[model samples]
Target: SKPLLKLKLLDALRQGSFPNLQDLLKKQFQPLDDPNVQQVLHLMLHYAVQVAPMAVIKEIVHHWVSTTNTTFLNIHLDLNERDSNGNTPLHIAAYQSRGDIVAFLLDQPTINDCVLNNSHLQAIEMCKNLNIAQMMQVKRSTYVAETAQEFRTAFNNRDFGHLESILSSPRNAELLDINGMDPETGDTVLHEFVKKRDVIMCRWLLEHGADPFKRDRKGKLPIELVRKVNENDTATNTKIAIDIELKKLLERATREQSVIDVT
Candidate 1:
């Protein structure tokens, strides 16, 4: 009944009719001796949070806090209490990305951020979707020619710091990949590196004199090798989409460089 009242209060607020809401609350709250009053109160509070005006919701929450000595300040003494959905209000608010409602629930210090649902997912994970989950899975790979397997090992391990120091002494960066290879496609280092979506890395290497149009034994450029890998998409569609866009950038850069050559 209190949840219904809460829903009605949303309508009342929207219609600018708070006096009727106050009277209804007065009648409903007075006879709060019912066995189901706690359930009703929970529903009312939850509903109010979902759709009420922020200012009015703040006022109503303040009223509840001041009038009920059983405010969340007493949470330490009663830790096992659970809402109807078995979530602490914090879990509900955050899962919905209702940041304002979250602020209200978090004003009390004891609200737990680590509360897990039945499936054992926490609030932060709940806020993220599958795309983000896959992005965070962390995959790293490096290609090396069969003859330069040792170089591939060091490159994959990112032991570039010492190499960078030595190369910088001679003002040379292109030599960093003089003996690199494509582990997946047998392309040279420059071709394989730019094929991935490392725009910053590609630009840095190119600016420091790594050839953008460097071709492998098959005469395919680095960007062309990137486009070739994207042709086989037996994997996740989301990842495939990302690969397609990254390849498109390669095509654009090659076209731009082609224009420069013709001029």
Candidate 2:
């Protein structure tokens, strides 16, 4: 037996038939997010210009974003997923001046606009629409002004999803500072995830570029904050702390004591 699944899906995409696409996907027996499925989705995006009703594309995207179990429908949309041009969907939409799609993608905490294309062009640079260009530029820059307390609010909000959305965006991640310290106590945001012992945030931060070499004001390296208990190894905490802290307590270790300096 042969399966022309991709062809069927593409045919549906070309016709802008959300109904047919949804029906085709409903029969998918493989993992929804498996590589084969993603490639087809990327190709769907590749032919984005030729697809039926821009609304149909949006509909498919909406289905990707909607909550679902691994069965009936599958296709997790990675906003950062690149097409043939190495352009993210944001780059393509911005290049196309699809004002509607560009604006929608920017609002997502998941898509990063800071990434460049094969030609070294950031998504916004491809935009000739001045208003949309400024909108894209300005929205990203606004996060530049966030403080420790402001970030703390998101971390504490039980709004785990929003934080992922932001952390998922690299430019937004820098603006939030995966390594920058808190002014009041000279603590790195890495240490806060340490204090809370949130493994998910800890996992994402460390992998996403939370610096391991830095020390806090109390002469604490991140690992020192991990508390061993009752003969337990504190392994998980140790993992997040970036392999336990302190190297002769570097006296000048407070790294960003003046990052926002010079009034």
Candidate 3:
């Protein structure tokens, strides 16, 4: 069972007692073993962003990043966490026009600048101050390149969650399709998804503007590649079922494309 929230940690955070907070964790919490410790950390970070002064927030966050023994606080906590409103710390800082915190987050190596809040606003889009907006522009340009690189890595690694997050945004429908190219095979992401017999990915890519009709270096459309894999596989009932579903999905996409083209 999850442990109860430690009010002492909450009190320490609200009082801006970083020392007390650190001591409390060392003495009372095994942050690595207890899931509640992670919950407590998220709550602390959320409150700090909402109410703590910029300098204090920075000090507390920096202490956790630099001193925390566990990768949970240093990596996932700082980079990927969301507040109650589905807003990352960057979202809160940007919405509040907290320039220092915004800059601090941008300086982090793995900061997910593209993360959207519940309202689907990216951190830059939530900027309320002109100065912060300008800073975000600079951060965004660099972050865009990093996001593209992330797409390639995610594709190579078959990270479905990250791929879904990127392709789920309608705004990015064409961004990767235009920029993503495998240097070795000269195939687009759509071709890669199809060749791997990734049914969900194929449907997602097609829906998100991936050009199924686009040919790879071998002059085969993504659908043709899917067909090739379907024909050769004589393995088992599960394989046959997957192939049938994939074929239906690709045919539907093709028919939709034809309709779109004719109109």
Candidate 4:
């Protein structure tokens, strides 16, 4: 009878068709003495995403927060508590890619965004869904940054190693979208390189086959965009050098037979 009652409850949870907790809890049957009960509970919880509405998870978390003095969901203020795999709730939220759930958890006053999973992946990597993971990773090689500024901080900070690792990895270079835009000006990567006046990165970007002629959202061509530079500033000087190198590359491309259109 106990097993039957648990079975019925498990079924109801699985189907997510339960009208009320009282209805399922009131079942007269009892669960059988077996390991299956734990398994059944684990399965129900693990696959809750399939049956439990997003609303239900939110409600349950709300109840937990309301009852406890805690505020954040994914974060663990205490270091002692560990999940089944030794991960904290933050790790779980991130691994699950429950962005909304993560956002909600972040709202807690006691929770900080400092949690890191055992795999070395940050919270951003975990909370982001597969689609976002790919997008942030440029689906293969890069990020979704619209401007050179996005790349600049990381680049100037010598974070290029990270970007380089991704770009050099097999199946990653294909994800680089030379056409990707800056969120503000809607300028492509090519435009950002030119706008930032980084001759070194510009030459590298072009040598790696970044397009020079590609235009921005403002209908301005790469050359047009570069021309806007002051020509005296360091950024503009880099832009000029890149412009010269790109022109030479174009001339060579025009005169020479195709070897490898790395661009």
Q: Highest lDDT, which number?
A: 3
* Tens-digit per-residue lDDT, 89-156, candidate 4: 44466567765555555454333344445675544566447764443344112223322354545555
Model 2: lDDT equals: 0.62
User: At residue 44, what lDDT does model 4 achieve?
Assistant: 33
lDDT scores of the candidates, listed in order? 0.48, 0.62, 0.67, 0.47
lDDT string for model 2 (1-263, tens) is 11365566657777777787677666652565576765666555445534446777676566665445342454566667777677887887887878777777777655567777889898899888888899887876654555345666676674667666666656664456666666555677767766666656665666556655666567665656655433223356655243233211111233423332221
Residues 1-263, model 1: lDDT tens digits: 65565555556555433345556566654455554544545454445555556665565455454433553222112111246456554455556666666655544433344455666754446444444323222210111132246445544554666435433532122223542444554656556565555655554445444454666767776666664453634346675665665566556566655422110
TM-score of model 1 relative to the true fold? 0.36
List, residue by residue over 167-195, the lDDT tens digit for candidate 3: 66443543345324655446677777776
Top-TM-score structure, candidate number: 2
Off by over 4 Å in 4: 1-152, 156-159, 170-176, 183-185, 228-246, 249-263
- The reply for model 3, stretches above 4 Å from the true place, is 1-10, 14-17, 28-38, 53-78, 146-211, 214-263
lDDT of 4 at 68: 52
The C-alpha TM-scores of every prediction are 0.36, 0.56, 0.51, 0.33
What are the root-mean-square deviations of the candidates from the true structure over C-alphas?
21.2, 9.3, 8.6, 14.1
